[PDB]
Each structure stands twice: as structure tokens, then as C-alpha cells.
């Protein structure tokens, strides 16, 4: 019998990224339950400034039982849900691709137009026509968001959600 | 707000309790000197029972109905065996903890809330003082009650108003099987619980000089 | 902390009396075990001289010792 | 028997933002219930000048029981439904992005157009072609609202909503 | 037994704005009932020159009871349905944004146009193309209704609607 | 580990003082175990108590044995 | 406010008399406990000389003592 909403700690060891859902296991080592395994998954946030781990299958070793308590995690000694990882993953690459394709388009067309008022022609050539395909592909790929990735060695804390036996 | 009043009550009561436990430890030997239970014990290691008196009772029931009496006496608790004489510590000592946790919720940042916090804490402190002293004097009344009861039993036993308790010692020699033994086995019991007599002709008076 | 100060120094702790022995052969005035002769006079904790604290916890601050006599000094109240 | 809609106080320790609903908890600190606690999630406001917390699972210790009172929170001593958070969040970034993209578009088109009456044409090139794509992306993402976040160390007051037994 | 539609006076403590509903409580203090609490939410007006507050959950202490008289408020010392709040909150911002974006559009187009009859061209550039996007965004956001807010330290009076026992 | 190495480095006085085989009986029997208590008193109730001078209890019934024991079951 | 003014100052309070003690051996003129001999010739509050104010809350402003008597002077008019 455990009261609703207690706090314990576990250990995350098998790495996962916020792209492919899969089974992840943590292990409660302090508090009441020691060595308890906890299998689940994660969620994808609408905005990537935090990340929570979907844990639903809690099991105690020794005797063949497995409770059906589902609850999620919290970071130890910060008490925050924002994942300790980097979030600046894919800003600069797509921004640079977009602006470079644009600048190429502009360079070729306007220095073609500037001939009214050989190597300069080849500059016009290269930027003028490699601008367009890279521009439409940049508008294709520009919308990819930035992810976070959980770690393979970071401990964690756990709050509870529903009561058990 | 009134949270300061409540914790002021707790702090004042606790601090006065600390001082009075210090004072009761300060005056020590005269206390158990004056409250000798061990001379009050009878022959067979039995605590004497506790008696209470009353002078000049009158109660009115209703219209055309009153009842008066000159002197009344009541047995409170019967006599029994005791493995040790008591002390005053289970009548006078009081508990002690520290009220330790004002949560960081109500902290005054303005002058007005500062001073009303101060005065509410102050009157809580005085209230705790009063409550602690009330507790002490109730304990005082209880221990005086018990001491008066046993000394009243001694006085009446001198007065020939109560029969003394009667005992029996059943002696047995050796006993047990070839596995267990006691050398001699004495069974001590008491039979006649002490009570008041009604034959007033056997009541013996006493006149001093 | 300084026990055998201005003595030879602390030699060891005898456990029969719970006491240190300095290098000069004298019983020092420090202790080493809890199983030694203390002179206690003051005590703490609620429900003294009674059954001790009851293991239960309730809605109110009502705390009662195991002999049933409650302790309103210990109890939380309004 | 708790009277309906009375006043207690609690403490929040775990932080989460107003983007992803999930488990958050508080613990009642004064009044009748001491050591009792209460789990839930938050609310979403259309205007971010207030923020309230959807708390439903109230647990009183001692027994293995969990009462069914769902209530919200208020700030002590201020008695306002706003949250201790920042509300100046997402004006400047989108405003500067839109205005810069538009200025770039204008620089390219007008400084090419007014030539009638090399590197200057390259300035025309750069702002001309990177204005347009950045402008349509700015018009795409301009509508993102301002956020607030619950505080990991801010205490709270609680009005009740219903009764218990 | 209480007569229909009677007049009492109460105390409001929590601040809430006419944008997001929530549990708000007043306290019956005078008249007959003492110490009664009153839980509800607000009402929405089409024009922001008045406010009323929905108040229905009427809880009386002493016995475990809570009656359900649903009632509103009337102003102490005026008995008028308007509220003590300001109503000029959302006029100047949208008006100034509209006029600024329009003036920018005009500046760019006409000062480019009248060139027939460098930094001035940059002024043409800037107002010319930041006018349009700001203009359509102003046309988007001009429709904001004016909010009013309850006071977190002002008491109230109450007109009743039905009887109770 | 410290107390065990102390135990082995003080070896011979231990089993010297705890001889077992000199105390066995004639037919290789371990003699039984006897417990003696002095000046006993119990309050079983109010109004009735029971006293006794000495009490004797048989703890372990004497059984057959082949090898005498040692401080194996007691000290290590 | 200063009870032992123009004297040796305050010594201590005695609750057996409910009186302060100045530092000269004269009894004070103030009080420290409510359990003392104060001369009162005035009272405040209603339902006096009856069973006290009844602990129910009536719909009317009529206030009834536990003798059943009615205090108009404590009740409100119309």
C-alpha cells in the first residue's frame, strides 16, 4: 500500500531520442522499493522545451508480480521537467541553407540584369541556377523541429499518480 | 495574520514549559523528601487506598425537598499490591518539544504587517504562559489529592473507622516435574478490601492535650 | 574534542567503563560509548512517564499516550 | 467534514510550463490538513494575464483512501489569479523578424528599381532575395502566443470547490 | 425562509479578469447569514460598460450544509451595474498600430512615385515594405474587445433571485 | 574482518579455556544444560503474587554425539 | 504605565496576591493576574441575570436568554 503522489528516485541507462518511441527501463533504488524495474515509453511535446517519460509498467523482483501503476518522472535536485540536453540542434543548418539559396538566386539574376547598365558571367550562371532548386528544397526541409535526447547515465526522480496495493 | 498568533502560543507555552522543568529539576531533594510514599506502605507491600472527606453538605432536589448531612466520606480507589513506591515525576513532570517550523509563507515586508505580526506573536506568547501555568496547577491539585487520600486512610485507621486489609500466605514446598522445579513456592493473596464500619459504638474518639 | 590535553595523549577507550585513558595512567573525563555512567537530569519528547507516543496519526493534533491519558500541552490546538 | 469553499494553503515544488499538461502536485501546509497533498495539471488561458492549476487528486495520509475534491489555487497576500511568471515573452523576436524581412525585401526591390534616375547591387541582391522567404516564414510563425510557467518554489493559497465525508 | 430578491452585502477577495473563467468566492457577512461563502464565476457582456458575477454555491457553516441560491451582485454606494475598472485599455494600441502601418505604406509608395518630379531611398525602402505586413496584421488584430477586471480588495452588495429556507 | 583476524591471532587460550571433551560423560554423551535462578517473584495480578527462592530448568536435553563441539557455532 | 515609579523599581509579581512588588518592601498598586481582588461595579453584555445568550441563530433579530426571557435592549428594532 502506497499513498498517492509520493516521490522516489530511479536510474536511466538505455538511451533514447525524442524521435522513435520504444521501451525504456528505469530502476528504483532508494525509498521503499529497491531494485524495482519500470518499463515504458515517452511523449512528444508540442514545444520542445521539456520532455517527460511515459512509464506505465512497474514490477518488483523476487515474486512474479507486476503492478499497473503509470506515472512519469522528474529531474533530481532541480525538480523540473525540462530535459538536460541541448535544444539548438537544427537552427543554424536550415537557416544557412535557406539564406544561401536565396542569396545565390539574387546574385545570378541581378548581375544578369546589371549587364545593361566571362568569369562574371559564370558567377551569374552558378548562383542564378543553383539558387532555385536549393531554395525550393530549403522551403521543403525548413519546417523540421529541434529535438532533445535523453541520456544513458542520468538518474531521475519520480512522483506518483494513482494508488496501489 | 493569526498564524503568528498560533505560533506565538506554541512558542510561549513551550518556553515556559522549559523554564518550569528547569525549576523543578533545580529544586529536587526537598520534593521527594516531602512526598515520601515509601513510609506510607503497609506490612505486605500494599499501597493504602485513597479516602475523601466532605464537611456540611446540603443539596436541594426541588420544591419541598432538601437533603443535608454533616460529614461524608468516600473510598476512591481500592488498595492493591505495588512492586515499587511511586514518585512525583508521574504527577508533576511535563513534556517538551520544539515548535520549530514557521513555513516561509507569511513574512512581513511592510512596517504595518511587521508590527501587527509582533503584537499578535506577543499576545500569543502571554496566552501560552497562562495555559502552561494552568496545566501545572491542575497537576498540583492531582498529586495533593492522592497524598491527602492516603494520609486520610492512615488517620482513619488510627481512628478505628476502617478494617485493615487481610492477607494469606499459602506455602508450598517443592513442586514440579523432573524437568522444572521451584525450591519453595509461596502464594500471597489479600482477601478483605478495606471498608468503613457502621457500628458507631466501636468508633473510638481521641482527645489531645 | 580535546580530551587528553596537557597529558600524554589519548591512548585508547576502555569499553568496560566507556572511558578514555590518556598516555599518563589516569582516567580521563571523556566518554567513548553510550554504555557508560552518565548523570542525566533533563529529558525530551512527548508522552513521558506514560506509554510513549501512540503510533497512529489523525486529522487533528490529538496525540495521546498509550495509557490513554492525553497530552494537551503536546497536542496541536486552536 | 470540510466545509465547502474554505481557505487553506499549499506549496508547489516541481516546475512545468503552460504548454504540456501532465502530473504536478502540491502539499497542504496549514489549516486542518497537514501533510495532505493534491495532484493534477493546469489550465490553458486564451489571454496569458492569469494562470490557474487544475488539481483534482486529494490524498490525506494515514489510511489508504483518496478523496474526490478537485480545486484550484490562488496566490497568498495578493489574491490575484495571475501566476508569478514573465509575460513579456514573445513580442520582440517575431516583431524584429517580420520587420527585418520586410526591410530586406524593400531594399532589394527599390534600390534595383531607382537605378534609372557592383557591390551596391550585391546589397540589392542579398536583401532582395532573403527578404521574401523570411517574410513568408514570419507570416507563417507570427501567431505563436506568449507563454507563462509555474514556479518551482512559490507557495500558494487554495479555495475549495466541493465537500467530502 | 428568506423573501425573494433581497439585498445583502458581501466581500470579494480574489482578482479575476473578464477573459478566463474560474472559481471565485465572495463572503456573506451582514443581514441575516454570517460567515456564509459563495462560489461562482462571471458573466460576459457584449459591450464592456458593465459587469455581473455569477454566484450560486452558497455554503453555510455550523452544520454540513450548502444551499444553492444563484444570484449576482449590485454596487455598494451606487447600485449601478457597471464595475470599478478602466475601459480605455485597448483603443490606443490598435489605433496607433493601424495608423503607423498605413503611414508607412503611403510613405514608401508616394515618395518612390514622386521621384520623377540614397538615404531618402532607404526611408522609402523601410516604410514601403514594413507597412504592408504590419497593415495586414493590424487588420487581423484590430477586433479585440475591451476587458474589465474585478477588484481584489473591493466588497460588494448582492441582489437575490430566488428564495431559500 | 578486524575482529576475525584478532580472533585467530589469539588462538590457543580460547579453546584452552573452553574445553569441551573433558566434560563429556562416560558413553560419549554430551551432558545436558541446566539453568538456575534466584529470588524469583511475579505479580500475576493484583491481590495475588507468587514468590520462590530458586528455580531450575532443563534447557537442552542430553543427546548422543560423535565429535565434541568447539567455538565454531559460537565465535566465528 | 510604570507601576513602581519614584521607588526602587519593579521586583517581581506574586500570584498569591496577584500583585506586583516594588524594590522597596511596599506592595504595589497594579495587578498581574486576573485571579486577584479587583473591585468591579460594572458589567458589559446582554442576557445578564438569566441563562446567557442562546447559542442558536434566529431568522429574526430577537435574542432570547436560556431562561426564555427576551432582551429588547439587545434585540434590534424595526
PDB file of N, CA, C and O in Angstrom, chain F residues 18-73:
ATOM      1  N   UNK F  18      37.902 -22.974  26.816  1.00  0.00           N
ATOM      2  CA  UNK F  18      36.651 -23.647  26.504  1.00  0.00           C
ATOM      3  C   UNK F  18      36.929 -25.080  26.063  1.00  0.00           C
ATOM      4  O   UNK F  18      36.748 -25.451  24.905  1.00  0.00           O
ATOM      5  N   UNK F  19      37.412 -25.884  27.003  1.00  0.00           N
ATOM      6  CA  UNK F  19      37.455 -27.316  26.758  1.00  0.00           C
ATOM      7  C   UNK F  19      36.036 -27.845  26.693  1.00  0.00           C
ATOM      8  O   UNK F  19      35.159 -27.403  27.434  1.00  0.00           O
ATOM      9  N   UNK F  20      35.818 -28.793  25.809  1.00  0.00           N
ATOM     10  CA  UNK F  20      34.549 -29.490  25.769  1.00  0.00           C
ATOM     11  C   UNK F  20      34.689 -30.962  26.092  1.00  0.00           C
ATOM     12  O   UNK F  20      33.894 -31.495  26.869  1.00  0.00           O
ATOM     13  N   UNK F  21      35.713 -31.618  25.545  1.00  0.00           N
ATOM     14  CA  UNK F  21      35.792 -33.069  25.591  1.00  0.00           C
ATOM     15  C   UNK F  21      36.130 -33.600  26.972  1.00  0.00           C
ATOM     16  O   UNK F  21      35.882 -34.779  27.243  1.00  0.00           O
ATOM     17  N   UNK F  22      36.697 -32.775  27.851  1.00  0.00           N
ATOM     18  CA  UNK F  22      36.910 -33.229  29.216  1.00  0.00           C
ATOM     19  C   UNK F  22      35.607 -33.321  29.981  1.00  0.00           C
ATOM     20  O   UNK F  22      35.540 -34.029  30.988  1.00  0.00           O
ATOM     21  N   UNK F  23      34.575 -32.631  29.524  1.00  0.00           N
ATOM     22  CA  UNK F  23      33.314 -32.591  30.234  1.00  0.00           C
ATOM     23  C   UNK F  23      32.314 -33.603  29.722  1.00  0.00           C
ATOM     24  O   UNK F  23      31.195 -33.649  30.232  1.00  0.00           O
ATOM     25  N   UNK F  24      32.673 -34.406  28.733  1.00  0.00           N
ATOM     26  CA  UNK F  24      31.728 -35.390  28.234  1.00  0.00           C
ATOM     27  C   UNK F  24      31.633 -36.548  29.216  1.00  0.00           C
ATOM     28  O   UNK F  24      32.494 -36.750  30.072  1.00  0.00           O
ATOM     29  N   UNK F  25      30.560 -37.307  29.100  1.00  0.00           N
ATOM     30  CA  UNK F  25      30.320 -38.368  30.058  1.00  0.00           C
ATOM     31  C   UNK F  25      31.038 -39.637  29.617  1.00  0.00           C
ATOM     32  O   UNK F  25      31.902 -39.614  28.739  1.00  0.00           O
ATOM     33  N   UNK F  26      30.686 -40.758  30.244  1.00  0.00           N
ATOM     34  CA  UNK F  26      31.419 -41.996  30.018  1.00  0.00           C
ATOM     35  C   UNK F  26      31.134 -42.571  28.641  1.00  0.00           C
ATOM     36  O   UNK F  26      32.054 -42.985  27.930  1.00  0.00           O
ATOM     37  N   UNK F  27      29.872 -42.591  28.237  1.00  0.00           N
ATOM     38  CA  UNK F  27      29.484 -43.235  26.988  1.00  0.00           C
ATOM     39  C   UNK F  27      29.347 -42.234  25.859  1.00  0.00           C
ATOM     40  O   UNK F  27      28.409 -42.328  25.064  1.00  0.00           O
ATOM     41  N   UNK F  28      30.266 -41.261  25.814  1.00  0.00           N
ATOM     42  CA  UNK F  28      30.402 -40.295  24.721  1.00  0.00           C
ATOM     43  C   UNK F  28      29.135 -39.471  24.539  1.00  0.00           C
ATOM     44  O   UNK F  28      28.717 -39.171  23.421  1.00  0.00           O
ATOM     45  N   UNK F  29      28.517 -39.117  25.656  1.00  0.00           N
ATOM     46  CA  UNK F  29      27.275 -38.363  25.671  1.00  0.00           C
ATOM     47  C   UNK F  29      27.585 -36.943  26.094  1.00  0.00           C
ATOM     48  O   UNK F  29      28.349 -36.723  27.040  1.00  0.00           O
ATOM     49  N   UNK F  30      27.008 -35.990  25.390  1.00  0.00           N
ATOM     50  CA  UNK F  30      27.069 -34.613  25.831  1.00  0.00           C
ATOM     51  C   UNK F  30      26.103 -34.442  26.987  1.00  0.00           C
ATOM     52  O   UNK F  30      24.917 -34.746  26.836  1.00  0.00           O
ATOM     53  N   UNK F  31      26.560 -34.003  28.151  1.00  0.00           N
ATOM     54  CA  UNK F  31      25.669 -33.815  29.291  1.00  0.00           C
ATOM     55  C   UNK F  31      24.729 -32.651  29.045  1.00  0.00           C
ATOM     56  O   UNK F  31      25.019 -31.790  28.203  1.00  0.00           O
ATOM     57  N   UNK F  32      23.573 -32.596  29.720  1.00  0.00           N
ATOM     58  CA  UNK F  32      22.575 -31.587  29.354  1.00  0.00           C
ATOM     59  C   UNK F  32      22.918 -30.204  29.878  1.00  0.00           C
ATOM     60  O   UNK F  32      24.004 -29.981  30.415  1.00  0.00           O
ATOM     61  N   UNK F  33      21.995 -29.264  29.718  1.00  0.00           N
ATOM     62  CA  UNK F  33      22.198 -27.871  30.090  1.00  0.00           C
ATOM     63  C   UNK F  33      21.169 -27.500  31.144  1.00  0.00           C
ATOM     64  O   UNK F  33      19.970 -27.729  30.953  1.00  0.00           O
ATOM     65  N   UNK F  34      21.629 -26.913  32.243  1.00  0.00           N
ATOM     66  CA  UNK F  34      20.765 -26.589  33.366  1.00  0.00           C
ATOM     67  C   UNK F  34      20.811 -25.103  33.673  1.00  0.00           C
ATOM     68  O   UNK F  34      21.875 -24.482  33.638  1.00  0.00           O
ATOM     69  N   UNK F  35      19.652 -24.537  33.986  1.00  0.00           N
ATOM     70  CA  UNK F  35      19.529 -23.121  34.287  1.00  0.00           C
ATOM     71  C   UNK F  35      18.987 -22.943  35.694  1.00  0.00           C
ATOM     72  O   UNK F  35      18.006 -23.595  36.074  1.00  0.00           O
ATOM     73  N   UNK F  36      19.626 -22.052  36.449  1.00  0.00           N
ATOM     74  CA  UNK F  36      19.309 -21.794  37.845  1.00  0.00           C
ATOM     75  C   UNK F  36      19.039 -20.313  38.029  1.00  0.00           C
ATOM     76  O   UNK F  36      19.819 -19.477  37.565  1.00  0.00           O
ATOM     77  N   UNK F  37      17.940 -19.992  38.697  1.00  0.00           N
ATOM     78  CA  UNK F  37      17.613 -18.615  39.006  1.00  0.00           C
ATOM     79  C   UNK F  37      17.277 -18.454  40.472  1.00  0.00           C
ATOM     80  O   UNK F  37      16.739 -19.358  41.109  1.00  0.00           O
ATOM     81  N   UNK F  38      17.580 -17.267  40.996  1.00  0.00           N
ATOM     82  CA  UNK F  38      17.491 -16.998  42.423  1.00  0.00           C
ATOM     83  C   UNK F  38      16.562 -15.832  42.726  1.00  0.00           C
ATOM     84  O   UNK F  38      16.578 -14.814  42.027  1.00  0.00           O
ATOM     85  N   UNK F  39      15.771 -16.006  43.790  1.00  0.00           N
ATOM     86  CA  UNK F  39      14.914 -14.985  44.399  1.00  0.00           C
ATOM     87  C   UNK F  39      13.894 -14.438  43.395  1.00  0.00           C
ATOM     88  O   UNK F  39      13.917 -13.274  43.003  1.00  0.00           O
ATOM     89  N   UNK F  40      13.003 -15.328  42.980  1.00  0.00           N
ATOM     90  CA  UNK F  40      12.041 -15.016  41.939  1.00  0.00           C
ATOM     91  C   UNK F  40      10.730 -14.541  42.540  1.00  0.00           C
ATOM     92  O   UNK F  40      10.308 -15.014  43.598  1.00  0.00           O
ATOM     93  N   UNK F  41      10.078 -13.623  41.838  1.00  0.00           N
ATOM     94  CA  UNK F  41       8.788 -13.085  42.231  1.00  0.00           C
ATOM     95  C   UNK F  41       8.070 -12.645  40.967  1.00  0.00           C
ATOM     96  O   UNK F  41       8.667 -11.997  40.106  1.00  0.00           O
ATOM     97  N   UNK F  42       6.795 -12.994  40.859  1.00  0.00           N
ATOM     98  CA  UNK F  42       5.968 -12.426  39.814  1.00  0.00           C
ATOM     99  C   UNK F  42       4.633 -11.974  40.373  1.00  0.00           C
ATOM    100  O   UNK F  42       4.000 -12.676  41.171  1.00  0.00           O
ATOM    101  N   UNK F  43       4.225 -10.784  39.945  1.00  0.00           N
ATOM    102  CA  UNK F  43       2.859 -10.304  40.090  1.00  0.00           C
ATOM    103  C   UNK F  43       2.081 -10.836  38.900  1.00  0.00           C
ATOM    104  O   UNK F  43       2.201 -10.321  37.789  1.00  0.00           O
ATOM    105  N   UNK F  44       1.295 -11.882  39.117  1.00  0.00           N
ATOM    106  CA  UNK F  44       0.397 -12.321  38.063  1.00  0.00           C
ATOM    107  C   UNK F  44      -0.860 -11.471  37.986  1.00  0.00           C
ATOM    108  O   UNK F  44      -1.506 -11.444  36.935  1.00  0.00           O
ATOM    109  N   UNK F  45      -1.202 -10.773  39.061  1.00  0.00           N
ATOM    110  CA  UNK F  45      -2.429  -9.997  39.153  1.00  0.00           C
ATOM    111  C   UNK F  45      -2.306  -9.112  40.380  1.00  0.00           C
ATOM    112  O   UNK F  45      -1.430  -9.308  41.222  1.00  0.00           O
ATOM    113  N   UNK F  46      -3.213  -8.147  40.482  1.00  0.00           N
ATOM    114  CA  UNK F  46      -3.492  -7.542  41.770  1.00  0.00           C
ATOM    115  C   UNK F  46      -4.107  -8.586  42.689  1.00  0.00           C
ATOM    116  O   UNK F  46      -4.716  -9.557  42.235  1.00  0.00           O
ATOM    117  N   UNK F  47      -3.885  -8.398  43.989  1.00  0.00           N
ATOM    118  CA  UNK F  47      -4.348  -9.206  45.119  1.00  0.00           C
ATOM    119  C   UNK F  47      -3.715 -10.588  45.212  1.00  0.00           C
ATOM    120  O   UNK F  47      -4.028 -11.318  46.163  1.00  0.00           O
ATOM    121  N   UNK F  48      -2.813 -10.957  44.302  1.00  0.00           N
ATOM    122  CA  UNK F  48      -2.209 -12.287  44.313  1.00  0.00           C
ATOM    123  C   UNK F  48      -0.858 -12.232  43.621  1.00  0.00           C
ATOM    124  O   UNK F  48      -0.781 -11.888  42.438  1.00  0.00           O
ATOM    125  N   UNK F  49       0.195 -12.598  44.344  1.00  0.00           N
ATOM    126  CA  UNK F  49       1.554 -12.637  43.832  1.00  0.00           C
ATOM    127  C   UNK F  49       2.168 -13.970  44.220  1.00  0.00           C
ATOM    128  O   UNK F  49       1.693 -14.657  45.127  1.00  0.00           O
ATOM    129  N   UNK F  50       3.243 -14.338  43.526  1.00  0.00           N
ATOM    130  CA  UNK F  50       3.875 -15.634  43.747  1.00  0.00           C
ATOM    131  C   UNK F  50       5.378 -15.457  43.839  1.00  0.00           C
ATOM    132  O   UNK F  50       5.994 -14.891  42.929  1.00  0.00           O
ATOM    133  N   UNK F  51       5.970 -15.945  44.928  1.00  0.00           N
ATOM    134  CA  UNK F  51       7.411 -15.868  45.113  1.00  0.00           C
ATOM    135  C   UNK F  51       7.979 -17.277  45.213  1.00  0.00           C
ATOM    136  O   UNK F  51       7.280 -18.247  45.526  1.00  0.00           O
ATOM    137  N   UNK F  52       9.274 -17.374  44.926  1.00  0.00           N
ATOM    138  CA  UNK F  52      10.011 -18.620  45.035  1.00  0.00           C
ATOM    139  C   UNK F  52      11.477 -18.289  45.245  1.00  0.00           C
ATOM    140  O   UNK F  52      11.942 -17.211  44.872  1.00  0.00           O
ATOM    141  N   UNK F  53      12.208 -19.226  45.848  1.00  0.00           N
ATOM    142  CA  UNK F  53      13.613 -18.948  46.123  1.00  0.00           C
ATOM    143  C   UNK F  53      14.483 -19.209  44.903  1.00  0.00           C
ATOM    144  O   UNK F  53      15.127 -18.297  44.380  1.00  0.00           O
ATOM    145  N   UNK F  54      14.531 -20.451  44.451  1.00  0.00           N
ATOM    146  CA  UNK F  54      15.317 -20.798  43.284  1.00  0.00           C
ATOM    147  C   UNK F  54      14.487 -21.650  42.345  1.00  0.00           C
ATOM    148  O   UNK F  54      13.628 -22.426  42.769  1.00  0.00           O
ATOM    149  N   UNK F  55      14.759 -21.485  41.065  1.00  0.00           N
ATOM    150  CA  UNK F  55      14.085 -22.219  40.012  1.00  0.00           C
ATOM    151  C   UNK F  55      15.126 -22.890  39.139  1.00  0.00           C
ATOM    152  O   UNK F  55      16.208 -22.339  38.919  1.00  0.00           O
ATOM    153  N   UNK F  56      14.809 -24.087  38.662  1.00  0.00           N
ATOM    154  CA  UNK F  56      15.725 -24.844  37.822  1.00  0.00           C
ATOM    155  C   UNK F  56      14.989 -25.384  36.608  1.00  0.00           C
ATOM    156  O   UNK F  56      13.906 -25.975  36.738  1.00  0.00           O
ATOM    157  N   UNK F  57      15.612 -25.199  35.445  1.00  0.00           N
ATOM    158  CA  UNK F  57      15.053 -25.523  34.139  1.00  0.00           C
ATOM    159  C   UNK F  57      16.060 -26.327  33.334  1.00  0.00           C
ATOM    160  O   UNK F  57      17.257 -26.032  33.354  1.00  0.00           O
ATOM    161  N   UNK F  58      15.580 -27.338  32.621  1.00  0.00           N
ATOM    162  CA  UNK F  58      16.415 -28.070  31.678  1.00  0.00           C
ATOM    163  C   UNK F  58      16.326 -27.386  30.323  1.00  0.00           C
ATOM    164  O   UNK F  58      15.256 -27.347  29.710  1.00  0.00           O
ATOM    165  N   UNK F  59      17.445 -26.846  29.848  1.00  0.00           N
ATOM    166  CA  UNK F  59      17.437 -26.125  28.582  1.00  0.00           C
ATOM    167  C   UNK F  59      17.558 -27.065  27.388  1.00  0.00           C
ATOM    168  O   UNK F  59      16.649 -27.145  26.559  1.00  0.00           O
ATOM    169  N   UNK F  60      18.672 -27.779  27.291  1.00  0.00           N
ATOM    170  CA  UNK F  60      18.914 -28.713  26.200  1.00  0.00           C
ATOM    171  C   UNK F  60      18.942 -30.120  26.762  1.00  0.00           C
ATOM    172  O   UNK F  60      19.720 -30.409  27.676  1.00  0.00           O
ATOM    173  N   UNK F  61      18.105 -30.987  26.217  1.00  0.00           N
ATOM    174  CA  UNK F  61      18.132 -32.382  26.615  1.00  0.00           C
ATOM    175  C   UNK F  61      19.410 -33.036  26.114  1.00  0.00           C
ATOM    176  O   UNK F  61      19.854 -32.782  24.993  1.00  0.00           O
ATOM    177  N   UNK F  62      20.012 -33.858  26.969  1.00  0.00           N
ATOM    178  CA  UNK F  62      21.271 -34.510  26.643  1.00  0.00           C
ATOM    179  C   UNK F  62      21.075 -35.546  25.547  1.00  0.00           C
ATOM    180  O   UNK F  62      20.219 -36.426  25.659  1.00  0.00           O
ATOM    181  N   UNK F  63      21.877 -35.453  24.492  1.00  0.00           N
ATOM    182  CA  UNK F  63      21.751 -36.357  23.365  1.00  0.00           C
ATOM    183  C   UNK F  63      23.093 -36.998  23.077  1.00  0.00           C
ATOM    184  O   UNK F  63      24.121 -36.626  23.644  1.00  0.00           O
ATOM    185  N   UNK F  64      23.067 -37.967  22.173  1.00  0.00           N
ATOM    186  CA  UNK F  64      24.296 -38.584  21.718  1.00  0.00           C
ATOM    187  C   UNK F  64      25.068 -37.621  20.837  1.00  0.00           C
ATOM    188  O   UNK F  64      24.512 -36.680  20.269  1.00  0.00           O
ATOM    189  N   UNK F  65      26.374 -37.859  20.739  1.00  0.00           N
ATOM    190  CA  UNK F  65      27.238 -37.053  19.890  1.00  0.00           C
ATOM    191  C   UNK F  65      28.457 -37.882  19.535  1.00  0.00           C
ATOM    192  O   UNK F  65      28.802 -38.847  20.220  1.00  0.00           O
ATOM    193  N   UNK F  66      29.090 -37.526  18.422  1.00  0.00           N
ATOM    194  CA  UNK F  66      30.314 -38.179  17.995  1.00  0.00           C
ATOM    195  C   UNK F  66      31.527 -37.292  18.223  1.00  0.00           C
ATOM    196  O   UNK F  66      32.466 -37.687  18.914  1.00  0.00           O
ATOM    197  N   UNK F  67      31.528 -36.105  17.666  1.00  0.00           N
ATOM    198  CA  UNK F  67      32.644 -35.224  17.920  1.00  0.00           C
ATOM    199  C   UNK F  67      32.241 -34.135  18.897  1.00  0.00           C
ATOM    200  O   UNK F  67      31.101 -33.662  18.857  1.00  0.00           O
ATOM    201  N   UNK F  68      33.121 -33.748  19.807  1.00  0.00           N
ATOM    202  CA  UNK F  68      32.833 -32.617  20.665  1.00  0.00           C
ATOM    203  C   UNK F  68      32.792 -31.340  19.854  1.00  0.00           C
ATOM    204  O   UNK F  68      33.519 -31.201  18.862  1.00  0.00           O
ATOM    205  N   UNK F  69      31.950 -30.403  20.221  1.00  0.00           N
ATOM    206  CA  UNK F  69      31.936 -29.124  19.510  1.00  0.00           C
ATOM    207  C   UNK F  69      33.090 -28.232  19.917  1.00  0.00           C
ATOM    208  O   UNK F  69      33.990 -28.641  20.656  1.00  0.00           O
ATOM    209  N   UNK F  70      33.076 -27.006  19.419  1.00  0.00           N
ATOM    210  CA  UNK F  70      34.103 -26.025  19.719  1.00  0.00           C
ATOM    211  C   UNK F  70      33.446 -24.656  19.657  1.00  0.00           C
ATOM    212  O   UNK F  70      32.219 -24.542  19.727  1.00  0.00           O
ATOM    213  N   UNK F  71      34.250 -23.614  19.498  1.00  0.00           N
ATOM    214  CA  UNK F  71      33.712 -22.278  19.299  1.00  0.00           C
ATOM    215  C   UNK F  71      33.311 -22.005  17.858  1.00  0.00           C
ATOM    216  O   UNK F  71      33.200 -20.833  17.483  1.00  0.00           O
ATOM    217  N   UNK F  72      33.117 -23.050  17.052  1.00  0.00           N
ATOM    218  CA  UNK F  72      32.634 -22.876  15.690  1.00  0.00           C
ATOM    219  C   UNK F  72      31.262 -22.232  15.673  1.00  0.00           C
ATOM    220  O   UNK F  72      31.045 -21.215  15.006  1.00  0.00           O
ATOM    221  N   UNK F  73      30.342 -22.774  16.450  1.00  0.00           N
ATOM    222  CA  UNK F  73      28.962 -22.337  16.424  1.00  0.00           C
ATOM    223  C   UNK F  73      28.728 -21.127  17.283  1.00  0.00           C
ATOM    224  O   UNK F  73      27.575 -20.773  17.536  1.00  0.00           O
TER     225      UNK F  73
END
